[PDB]
Coordinates of C-alpha atoms (C1' of nucleotides) in Angstrom, one line a residue:
Chain K
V22 CA -0.2 0.0 0.0
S23 CA 1.1 3.5 0.4
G24 CA 2.1 3.1 3.8
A25 CA 4.6 0.5 2.0
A26 CA 6.9 3.4 0.2
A27 CA 6.4 5.4 2.9
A28 CA 8.0 2.7 5.3
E29 CA 11.2 3.0 3.0
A30 CA 11.4 6.7 3.0
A31 CA 11.0 6.6 6.8
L32 CA 14.3 3.8 7.2
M33 CA 16.8 6.1 4.9
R34 CA 16.0 8.9 7.3
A35 CA 16.2 6.4 10.1
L36 CA 20.1 5.2 8.7
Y37 CA 20.8 9.5 8.1
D38 CA 20.4 9.8 12.0
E39 CA 22.3 7.4 13.1
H40 CA 25.2 7.3 10.3
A41 CA 25.6 10.5 7.8
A42 CA 27.3 12.5 10.9
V43 CA 29.9 10.0 11.6
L44 CA 30.4 9.7 8.1
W45 CA 30.5 13.3 7.4
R46 CA 33.5 13.0 10.1
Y47 CA 35.4 10.1 8.3
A48 CA 35.3 11.9 4.7
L49 CA 36.1 14.9 6.7
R50 CA 39.6 13.5 7.5
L51 CA 40.4 11.9 4.1
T52 CA 39.5 15.1 2.5
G53 CA 40.2 18.5 4.6
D54 CA 36.4 19.8 2.8
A55 CA 34.2 20.4 4.4
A56 CA 32.1 21.2 1.5
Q57 CA 33.6 17.3 -0.6
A58 CA 32.5 15.4 2.4
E59 CA 29.2 16.8 2.2
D60 CA 28.8 15.3 -1.6
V61 CA 30.8 11.8 -0.5
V62 CA 27.9 11.4 2.2
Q63 CA 25.3 12.3 -0.1
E64 CA 27.3 9.9 -2.4
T65 CA 27.3 7.2 -0.3
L66 CA 23.4 6.8 1.4
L67 CA 22.7 7.2 -2.3
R68 CA 24.6 4.2 -2.8
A69 CA 22.7 2.4 1.0
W70 CA 19.3 3.4 -0.7
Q71 CA 20.5 1.5 -4.3
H72 CA 21.5 -1.4 -2.0
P73 CA 18.9 -3.0 -0.4
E74 CA 21.1 -6.4 1.1
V75 CA 23.0 -3.0 3.3
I76 CA 19.6 -1.8 4.4
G77 CA 18.4 -5.4 4.4
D78 CA 20.0 -6.9 8.5
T79 CA 20.4 -4.2 11.2
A80 CA 21.9 -7.6 12.6
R81 CA 25.3 -6.3 10.8
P82 CA 27.0 -3.3 11.1
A83 CA 25.8 -0.8 7.6
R84 CA 29.0 1.8 9.1
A85 CA 30.9 -0.8 8.3
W86 CA 29.9 -1.1 4.9
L87 CA 29.8 2.7 4.6
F88 CA 33.1 3.9 5.9
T89 CA 34.7 1.6 2.5
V90 CA 32.3 2.5 -0.3
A91 CA 33.1 6.5 1.5
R92 CA 37.0 5.4 1.5
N93 CA 37.1 4.3 -2.1
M94 CA 35.0 7.3 -3.0
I95 CA 37.8 9.7 -2.4
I96 CA 40.9 7.9 -3.7
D97 CA 38.6 7.6 -7.5
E98 CA 38.8 11.8 -6.8
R99 CA 42.5 11.5 -6.5
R100 CA 43.1 10.4 -9.5
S101 CA 43.5 12.2 -12.7
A102 CA 41.7 15.4 -12.8
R103 CA 42.5 16.8 -9.5
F104 CA 46.1 15.5 -10.4
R105 CA 46.6 18.9 -13.1
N106 CA 44.6 21.0 -11.5
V107 CA 43.9 21.4 -8.1
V108 CA 47.8 23.0 -7.5
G109 CA 47.3 26.5 -8.1
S110 CA 44.7 29.7 -7.1
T111 CA 45.1 32.5 -9.1
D112 CA 43.5 34.3 -6.2
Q113 CA 46.0 32.9 -4.2
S114 CA 49.2 34.7 -4.0
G115 CA 52.1 33.4 -5.8
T116 CA 50.9 33.7 -9.0
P117 CA 51.7 35.5 -11.5
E118 CA 48.7 37.5 -13.7
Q119 CA 49.0 37.1 -17.2
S120 CA 49.9 40.0 -19.7
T121 CA 50.2 40.7 -22.7
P122 CA 52.5 42.9 -25.1
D123 CA 51.9 46.3 -26.3
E124 CA 50.8 47.1 -29.9
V125 CA 53.4 49.5 -30.9
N126 CA 55.1 47.0 -33.1
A127 CA 52.3 45.7 -34.7
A128 CA 50.7 49.9 -35.0
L129 CA 53.9 51.0 -36.4
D130 CA 53.6 47.7 -39.4
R131 CA 50.6 48.8 -40.0
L132 CA 50.9 52.8 -40.5
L133 CA 54.1 51.6 -42.7
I134 CA 51.6 48.7 -45.0
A135 CA 49.2 51.9 -44.7
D136 CA 51.4 54.5 -45.8
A137 CA 52.7 52.0 -49.1
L138 CA 48.9 51.3 -50.0
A139 CA 47.8 54.8 -50.7
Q140 CA 50.7 54.7 -54.0
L141 CA 48.8 51.6 -55.2
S142 CA 46.6 51.7 -58.3
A143 CA 42.6 51.2 -57.3
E144 CA 42.9 48.3 -58.6
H145 CA 46.1 47.1 -56.7
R146 CA 45.1 48.1 -53.7
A147 CA 41.2 46.6 -54.0
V148 CA 42.6 42.9 -54.6
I149 CA 45.5 43.0 -51.6
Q150 CA 43.1 44.0 -49.3
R151 CA 40.2 41.3 -50.8
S152 CA 43.3 38.4 -50.2
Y153 CA 45.1 39.8 -47.0
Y154 CA 42.7 41.8 -45.0
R155 CA 39.5 39.6 -46.0
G156 CA 41.1 36.1 -46.1
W157 CA 39.0 35.5 -49.6
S158 CA 40.2 32.7 -52.7
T159 CA 41.6 33.8 -55.3
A160 CA 38.9 32.4 -56.9
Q161 CA 36.5 34.5 -54.4
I162 CA 37.9 38.0 -55.7
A163 CA 37.5 37.2 -59.2
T164 CA 34.1 36.7 -58.6
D165 CA 33.1 39.7 -56.7
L166 CA 35.2 42.2 -59.2
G167 CA 34.2 40.2 -62.4
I168 CA 37.5 40.0 -63.4
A169 CA 39.5 36.6 -64.7
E170 CA 41.1 34.3 -62.5
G171 CA 44.9 34.8 -63.8
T172 CA 44.1 38.8 -63.3
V173 CA 43.9 38.7 -59.9
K174 CA 47.1 36.0 -59.5
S175 CA 48.6 38.6 -61.8
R176 CA 47.6 41.9 -59.9
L177 CA 48.4 40.2 -56.4
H178 CA 51.8 38.8 -57.6
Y179 CA 52.7 42.5 -58.8
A180 CA 51.3 44.5 -56.2
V181 CA 53.5 42.3 -53.5
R182 CA 56.2 43.5 -55.3
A183 CA 54.9 47.0 -56.1
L184 CA 54.5 47.4 -52.0
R185 CA 58.2 45.7 -51.8
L186 CA 59.5 48.4 -53.7
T187 CA 57.8 51.2 -51.7
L188 CA 59.2 49.7 -48.3
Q189 CA 62.7 49.5 -49.2
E190 CA 62.8 52.6 -50.3
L191 CA 61.6 53.5 -47.2
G192 CA 63.9 51.8 -45.5
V193 CA 62.1 48.7 -43.6
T194 CA 63.8 45.3 -43.1
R195 CA 63.9 42.7 -44.8
Chain D
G30 CA 1.8 65.4 4.4
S31 CA 0.8 65.2 0.2
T32 CA 4.6 64.2 -0.7
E33 CA 5.6 60.9 -1.5
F34 CA 8.7 61.2 1.0
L35 CA 9.0 58.1 3.7
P36 CA 8.3 59.8 6.8
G37 CA 11.3 59.4 8.8
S38 CA 13.9 59.3 6.1
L39 CA 16.6 61.9 5.7
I40 CA 16.5 64.2 2.5
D41 CA 18.3 66.7 1.5
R42 CA 16.7 70.7 2.3
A43 CA 16.3 71.3 -1.4
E44 CA 13.8 68.7 -2.6
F45 CA 11.8 68.8 0.6
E46 CA 11.2 73.3 -0.3
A47 CA 11.3 72.5 -4.1
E48 CA 8.5 69.3 -3.2
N49 CA 6.3 71.3 -0.6
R50 CA 6.8 73.9 -3.6
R51 CA 4.8 71.8 -5.4
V52 CA 2.4 70.4 -3.6
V53 CA 1.7 73.6 -1.5
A54 CA 0.7 75.7 -4.8
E55 CA -1.2 72.3 -5.7
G56 CA -3.5 72.3 -2.5
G57 CA -2.0 69.4 -1.0
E58 CA -0.4 69.6 2.8
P59 CA 3.5 70.4 2.3
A60 CA 5.6 67.9 3.8
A61 CA 7.0 68.6 7.6
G62 CA 10.3 69.3 8.1
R63 CA 13.0 69.1 11.1
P64 CA 16.9 70.3 10.5
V65 CA 19.0 66.6 11.2
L66 CA 22.5 66.8 12.1
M67 CA 24.5 63.7 10.3
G68 CA 28.1 62.7 10.9
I69 CA 30.1 62.7 7.9
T70 CA 30.5 58.8 7.6
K71 CA 26.4 58.7 7.7
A72 CA 25.9 61.8 5.0
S73 CA 28.3 60.1 2.6
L74 CA 26.3 57.1 1.9
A75 CA 23.2 59.1 1.7
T76 CA 24.7 61.4 -1.4
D77 CA 22.5 60.6 -4.2
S78 CA 24.5 58.7 -6.3
Chain S
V13 CA -0.4 16.9 7.5
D14 CA -2.0 13.1 8.3
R15 CA -4.5 14.5 9.7
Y16 CA -5.1 17.5 8.5
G17 CA -3.7 17.6 5.5
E18 CA -6.9 19.2 3.5
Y19 CA -6.6 22.0 5.5
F20 CA -3.5 23.5 4.7
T21 CA -0.7 23.2 2.4
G22 CA 2.6 23.9 3.9
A23 CA 6.5 23.6 2.5
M24 CA 9.8 24.0 3.3
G25 CA 13.3 25.6 2.3
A26 CA 13.8 28.7 -0.6
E27 CA 10.7 27.8 -2.9
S28 CA 8.1 28.2 0.2
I29 CA 9.9 31.3 0.7
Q30 CA 8.9 31.7 -3.1
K31 CA 5.4 30.8 -2.4
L32 CA 5.5 33.7 0.3
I33 CA 6.3 36.6 -1.2
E34 CA 3.7 35.1 -4.6
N35 CA 1.1 35.4 -1.6
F36 CA 2.0 39.0 -0.7
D37 CA 0.3 42.1 -1.7
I38 CA 2.8 45.0 -1.5
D39 CA 0.3 47.4 -1.8
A40 CA -2.3 46.8 1.5
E41 CA 1.1 45.9 3.6
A42 CA 2.4 49.3 3.2
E43 CA -0.6 51.1 4.0
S44 CA -1.3 49.2 7.0
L45 CA 2.0 49.9 7.7
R46 CA 1.2 53.7 7.4
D47 CA -1.4 53.7 9.4
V48 CA 1.1 52.5 12.3
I49 CA 3.2 55.6 11.1
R50 CA 0.1 57.5 11.3
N51 CA -0.6 57.2 14.8
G52 CA 1.6 55.4 16.7
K53 CA 4.1 54.8 20.2
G54 CA 7.6 55.4 18.8
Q55 CA 8.8 52.0 20.6
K56 CA 6.7 50.3 17.6
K57 CA 6.7 53.0 15.2
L58 CA 10.3 52.5 14.2
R59 CA 9.9 49.5 13.7
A60 CA 7.4 49.9 11.1
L61 CA 8.8 53.1 9.5
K62 CA 11.9 50.7 8.8
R63 CA 10.1 48.5 7.4
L64 CA 7.9 50.7 5.0
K65 CA 10.9 52.0 4.1
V66 CA 12.1 48.6 2.2
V67 CA 8.8 47.9 1.2
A68 CA 7.6 51.1 -0.7
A69 CA 10.9 50.1 -2.7
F70 CA 8.7 47.2 -4.1
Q71 CA 5.4 49.6 -4.7
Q72 CA 6.4 52.1 -6.4
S73 CA 9.9 51.1 -8.5
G74 CA 7.3 48.4 -10.4
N75 CA 9.7 45.4 -9.4
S76 CA 8.9 42.6 -7.9
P77 CA 10.4 41.3 -4.2
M78 CA 10.6 37.8 -6.2
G79 CA 13.6 38.5 -7.9
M80 CA 15.3 38.0 -4.3
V81 CA 14.5 34.3 -4.6
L82 CA 16.4 32.8 -8.2
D83 CA 15.4 29.8 -10.8
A84 CA 18.3 30.7 -12.7
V85 CA 22.0 31.6 -11.7
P86 CA 24.4 33.2 -14.1
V87 CA 27.7 32.4 -15.2
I88 CA 30.7 34.8 -15.1
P89 CA 33.2 35.1 -17.9
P90 CA 35.4 32.8 -18.6
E91 CA 38.3 35.4 -18.8
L92 CA 37.6 36.9 -15.7
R93 CA 37.9 33.5 -13.7
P94 CA 40.6 33.0 -15.8
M95 CA 43.0 29.1 -15.1
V96 CA 46.2 29.4 -15.5
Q97 CA 49.1 27.1 -16.4
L98 CA 52.5 27.2 -14.1
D99 CA 56.0 26.3 -14.9
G100 CA 55.8 22.4 -13.6
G101 CA 53.4 21.4 -15.7
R102 CA 50.7 21.6 -13.2
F103 CA 47.4 24.3 -13.3
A104 CA 46.4 27.4 -10.5
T105 CA 43.1 28.0 -11.2
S106 CA 40.4 30.9 -9.7
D107 CA 38.8 30.4 -6.6
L108 CA 35.4 31.4 -8.7
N109 CA 35.9 28.1 -10.6
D110 CA 35.9 26.1 -7.3
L111 CA 33.1 27.8 -6.5
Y112 CA 30.8 27.3 -9.6
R113 CA 31.9 23.9 -9.9
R114 CA 31.2 22.8 -6.6
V115 CA 27.4 24.6 -7.1
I116 CA 27.1 22.8 -10.6
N117 CA 28.0 19.4 -8.9
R118 CA 25.3 19.7 -6.5
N119 CA 22.4 21.3 -8.5
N120 CA 23.4 18.4 -11.0
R121 CA 23.0 15.9 -7.8
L122 CA 19.5 17.4 -7.1
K123 CA 17.8 16.3 -10.5
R124 CA 19.1 12.7 -10.0
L125 CA 17.6 12.7 -6.8
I126 CA 14.6 14.2 -8.6
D127 CA 14.5 12.1 -11.4
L128 CA 15.6 9.4 -9.0
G129 CA 12.6 9.7 -6.4
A130 CA 15.0 9.3 -3.9
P131 CA 13.4 9.6 -0.4
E132 CA 12.3 12.7 0.6
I133 CA 15.3 13.1 3.5
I134 CA 18.2 13.3 0.5
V135 CA 16.3 15.7 -1.6
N136 CA 15.9 18.8 1.0
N137 CA 18.8 17.7 2.4
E138 CA 20.2 18.0 -0.5
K139 CA 19.0 21.0 -1.5
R140 CA 19.9 23.1 1.5
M141 CA 23.5 22.4 0.4
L142 CA 22.8 24.0 -3.1
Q143 CA 21.5 27.2 -0.8
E144 CA 24.7 26.6 1.4
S145 CA 26.8 26.6 -1.8
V146 CA 25.4 29.2 -4.0
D147 CA 25.2 31.3 -1.1
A148 CA 28.8 31.0 -0.8
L149 CA 29.5 31.9 -4.5
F150 CA 27.5 35.4 -4.1
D151 CA 29.5 35.7 -0.8
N152 CA 31.4 33.5 0.9
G153 CA 31.5 33.8 4.7
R154 CA 28.5 35.5 5.0
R155 CA 26.6 33.2 6.6
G156 CA 27.8 30.6 9.5
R157 CA 32.0 29.4 8.2
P158 CA 33.8 30.2 5.0
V159 CA 34.4 27.6 2.4
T160 CA 37.7 26.7 3.3
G161 CA 40.2 25.7 0.5
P162 CA 43.5 23.9 0.5
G163 CA 44.8 24.8 3.9
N164 CA 42.2 26.0 5.5
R165 CA 42.1 29.5 3.9
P166 CA 38.1 31.2 2.4
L167 CA 37.5 31.4 -0.3
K168 CA 36.9 34.4 -2.4
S169 CA 33.8 35.3 -3.1
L170 CA 32.4 37.1 -6.1
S171 CA 31.3 39.8 -3.1
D172 CA 35.0 39.7 -2.2
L173 CA 36.4 40.9 -5.1
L174 CA 34.4 44.6 -4.1
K175 CA 34.9 45.1 -1.2
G176 CA 37.8 46.4 0.7
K177 CA 41.4 47.9 -0.4
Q178 CA 41.6 45.1 -2.9
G179 CA 38.4 45.4 -4.4
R180 CA 37.1 46.8 -7.7
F181 CA 36.7 49.9 -6.8
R182 CA 39.7 50.9 -4.7
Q183 CA 42.2 48.9 -6.5
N184 CA 40.9 49.3 -10.1
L185 CA 38.8 52.4 -10.6
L186 CA 39.5 55.1 -8.6
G187 CA 43.4 54.3 -8.8
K188 CA 44.6 52.9 -11.7
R189 CA 48.4 52.1 -12.9
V190 CA 49.5 54.2 -15.6
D191 CA 52.0 54.7 -18.5
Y192 CA 54.4 56.7 -19.5
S193 CA 55.2 57.2 -15.4
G194 CA 58.4 56.1 -14.0
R195 CA 60.3 56.6 -10.0
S196 CA 64.0 57.0 -9.3
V197 CA 65.7 58.3 -6.2
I198 CA 65.4 62.0 -5.6
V199 CA 68.7 64.5 -4.6
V200 CA 69.2 68.3 -4.0
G201 CA 69.3 70.3 -6.4
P202 CA 70.7 73.2 -5.5
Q203 CA 71.4 75.6 -8.5
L204 CA 68.3 73.7 -9.7
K205 CA 65.6 77.0 -10.4
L206 CA 61.9 76.3 -8.3
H207 CA 60.6 75.3 -11.8
Chain Q
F10 CA 28.4 60.2 -22.8
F11 CA 25.5 58.4 -21.7
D12 CA 23.8 60.2 -18.9
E13 CA 22.3 57.6 -16.1
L14 CA 23.9 53.9 -14.7
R15 CA 20.0 52.2 -13.6
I16 CA 21.0 48.9 -11.1
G17 CA 17.9 46.8 -10.2
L18 CA 17.4 43.2 -9.3
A19 CA 17.9 41.0 -12.1
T20 CA 14.2 38.9 -12.8
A21 CA 15.0 34.8 -13.5
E22 CA 13.8 36.0 -16.8
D23 CA 17.4 38.4 -17.2
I24 CA 19.4 36.2 -16.2
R25 CA 18.5 33.8 -19.0
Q26 CA 18.1 36.9 -21.9
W27 CA 22.3 37.3 -20.5
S28 CA 23.0 33.6 -20.8
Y29 CA 24.6 32.5 -23.8
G30 CA 23.1 28.7 -23.0
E31 CA 23.0 26.7 -19.7
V32 CA 26.1 25.2 -18.1
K33 CA 25.1 21.6 -17.8
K34 CA 28.5 19.4 -17.2
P35 CA 30.5 20.6 -14.4
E36 CA 33.6 19.7 -16.0
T37 CA 36.8 22.8 -17.1
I38 CA 38.9 21.5 -19.4
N39 CA 40.9 18.3 -20.6
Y40 CA 44.5 17.9 -19.1
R41 CA 45.6 16.9 -22.3
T42 CA 44.5 18.2 -25.0
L43 CA 43.7 22.2 -23.6
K44 CA 40.6 22.1 -25.1
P45 CA 38.0 23.3 -22.7
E46 CA 35.0 20.6 -21.8
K47 CA 31.9 20.3 -23.9
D48 CA 28.8 22.5 -21.5
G49 CA 31.6 23.1 -19.1
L50 CA 32.5 25.9 -17.2
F51 CA 34.5 26.8 -20.4
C52 CA 32.0 25.7 -23.3
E53 CA 33.1 27.5 -26.8
Chain T
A16 CA 15.2 24.1 -6.7
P17 CA 14.6 27.8 -5.9
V18 CA 17.2 29.1 -3.9
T19 CA 17.9 32.3 -1.9
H20 CA 20.6 35.8 -2.4
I21 CA 22.4 35.5 1.0
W22 CA 22.9 39.5 0.4
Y23 CA 19.0 40.2 0.7
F24 CA 18.2 36.7 3.6
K25 CA 21.6 37.6 6.3
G26 CA 23.3 41.1 5.5
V27 CA 21.7 43.2 8.4
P28 CA 19.3 44.2 8.5
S29 CA 17.7 41.2 7.3
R30 CA 15.4 42.5 4.2
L31 CA 13.4 39.7 3.3
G32 CA 12.5 39.1 7.4
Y33 CA 11.6 43.3 6.6
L34 CA 9.1 42.0 3.4
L35 CA 7.5 39.1 5.2
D36 CA 7.7 40.5 8.6
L37 CA 9.2 37.1 10.1
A38 CA 11.8 37.1 11.9
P39 CA 15.5 36.3 11.0
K40 CA 16.7 33.2 12.8
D41 CA 13.2 32.1 12.2
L42 CA 13.8 33.0 8.4
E43 CA 17.4 31.0 8.7
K44 CA 15.1 27.7 10.0
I45 CA 13.0 28.1 6.7
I46 CA 15.4 28.9 4.2
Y47 CA 18.2 25.7 5.4
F48 CA 15.7 23.2 5.8
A49 CA 15.2 23.2 9.6
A50 CA 11.2 24.1 10.4
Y51 CA 8.1 24.1 8.2
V52 CA 6.4 26.8 7.3
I53 CA 2.8 27.3 6.4
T54 CA 2.0 28.8 2.8
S55 CA -2.1 28.5 3.0
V56 CA -4.8 27.2 5.2
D57 CA -7.9 27.1 3.7
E58 CA -9.8 28.6 6.6
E59 CA -13.4 28.9 5.6
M60 CA -13.0 25.1 4.7
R61 CA -11.7 24.4 8.5
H62 CA -15.0 26.4 10.1
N63 CA -17.5 24.3 8.4
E64 CA -16.0 21.1 10.5
Chain P
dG27 C1' 10.6 46.0 25.7
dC28 C1' 16.5 45.8 26.8
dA29 C1' 20.6 42.8 26.1
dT30 C1' 23.1 40.6 23.2
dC31 C1' 25.7 40.0 18.7
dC32 C1' 26.4 40.9 14.6
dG33 C1' 28.5 43.2 10.7
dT34 C1' 31.5 47.4 8.8
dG35 C1' 35.8 49.9 9.0
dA36 C1' 40.8 50.3 10.1
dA37 C1' 47.0 55.8 5.7
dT38 C1' 50.2 55.7 0.5
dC39 C1' 54.2 54.3 -3.2
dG40 C1' 57.9 51.4 -4.0
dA41 C1' 62.0 46.5 -3.8
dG42 C1' 63.1 42.0 -4.3
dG43 C1' 62.4 36.6 -2.8
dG44 C1' 59.1 30.4 -2.4
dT45 C1' 55.5 28.2 -3.1
Chain Y
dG8 C1' 32.9 -4.3 -5.5
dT9 C1' 32.1 -2.6 -1.4
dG10 C1' 30.7 -4.8 4.4
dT11 C1' 34.1 -7.1 12.6
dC12 C1' 36.6 -0.8 15.9
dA13 C1' 36.9 1.9 12.3
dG14 C1' 35.3 9.4 13.3
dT15 C1' 38.8 17.7 11.5
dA16 C1' 42.4 21.1 12.6
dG17 C1' 42.6 24.5 14.7
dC18 C1' 42.4 27.8 17.9
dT19 C1' 40.6 34.1 20.7
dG20 C1' 46.3 37.2 21.9
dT21 C1' 42.6 43.3 17.8
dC22 C1' 38.9 46.4 18.6
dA23 C1' 35.5 50.8 18.7
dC24 C1' 30.8 51.5 17.0
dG25 C1' 26.2 50.8 15.4
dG26 C1' 22.1 48.7 15.0
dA27 C1' 19.0 44.4 13.5
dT28 C1' 18.9 40.4 16.1
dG29 C1' 16.8 38.0 19.3
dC30 C1' 15.5 36.0 25.4
Chain I
rC6 C1' 50.7 36.5 1.9
rC7 C1' 57.8 35.8 4.5
rU8 C1' 62.1 40.4 3.9
rC9 C1' 62.8 45.6 3.2
rG10 C1' 63.0 50.9 2.1
rA11 C1' 60.5 56.7 2.3

DNA sequence: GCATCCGTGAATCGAGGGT
DNA sequence: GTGTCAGTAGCTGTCACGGATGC
RNA sequence: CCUCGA
């Protein structure tokens, strides 16, 4: 009946009141983290509910079966995932903060490329800005500009050398 | 009175006379006042920002 | 419940308070406090004044008090909780990842217990842990004993990111650290002009 | 130039309106591939 | 399962306790599963029985 | 209605070294 | 898969002050 | 967070 399903809930609440607080202390010594001990207790008593053989015999100590399930859970936590990560906390002192370099070298190159680009024809400039700045393919630029495939290859081939002319004339290091 | 000022709250003496200026001219009762001394620590937290 | 369950409805935890806020007339409780304020004893008037300070705020503004109870918790972007590598090959992470991670573990366990029909004692005793875990994510240490990390060190919470000299306001907003600057030892120069 | 800075209680609908997805799994990253796990705290 | 924002429960004064007229300690028992709370009661059906 | 106890605050910049 | 006792470290050697919390 | 300098 409905009271038979409620007798199982009053049975779990019974072993909670006799073993949970003692099992929490045991897992607390093996881990040292109270929030982790609570997680081990919930998982240990969950396996007790899933095993009626352990909850059957009251004349046999179910406490010993709990300490063994909790012990095995704790050593499994102590493997690979904890191995690498558990070491450091950024909030904790002694860890170097991440840094990013300044864009000075990138800004100077961008300024010199923008000067050499202005001294190019509208055709060559509109082809290097679609191959290197937009990253399109050779056929994609040919489709957009309405020109031949080899026309894009030739314009790119000269425009690169045209830029190398202007940069070497200004002393840009190879 | 006729204001929305929660009684007991500490309000700047400029909005009080500017709010009582509208309710006095509206017909309702202007809110009452009483000067209050606040410490510098308490007055800073009471700023409008 | 076993006897007169047909006549009342009760509940526990935070979901109950969520229900108490729902069955609450904000405007009615506001005017009840003003009536106490108009004519009352200062002993019992100050306690009604301060309540009105909070209740009238939900009345005028148009925001529901239900927001004080959360159904979903936001996750802070990863660059603000970064995980950095150590020169020994091991890893060091932000405390927030542990705090967020411990909330997720307990939140995923709750979905298992609800699906599995676990005893009401485990589901209720788990929801409390989810409440205590979420309480640490926002302000660890505020209630009770702080969540200790490795070495009995209280973990930093989101609210610890803003408090005091190391918080975001005083350390990174009222004073930044600037480019184009330097420092050195000072030496007196008598020949120098004042300017 | 923006005048006011409004602050308020975040509705559960706002919390979902901000989030680009729910964090289901509790994993962080992989400790071999450096790839963040899917649906983890670093889900791409 | 819904959860409460500690800023509005434990921060003094307890904002929830001021809203629902519940004592902070009484509110502490409810949230952390130490005491049940009555959400609704059909007082009229009770009177007729 | 009052004693208790909770939470808030407690100077600025700078060097170098470990985990 | 698990099954006889099988149970933290650490720590209080700060303080003034206000007001919500609580008997 | 250890030591130190105005």
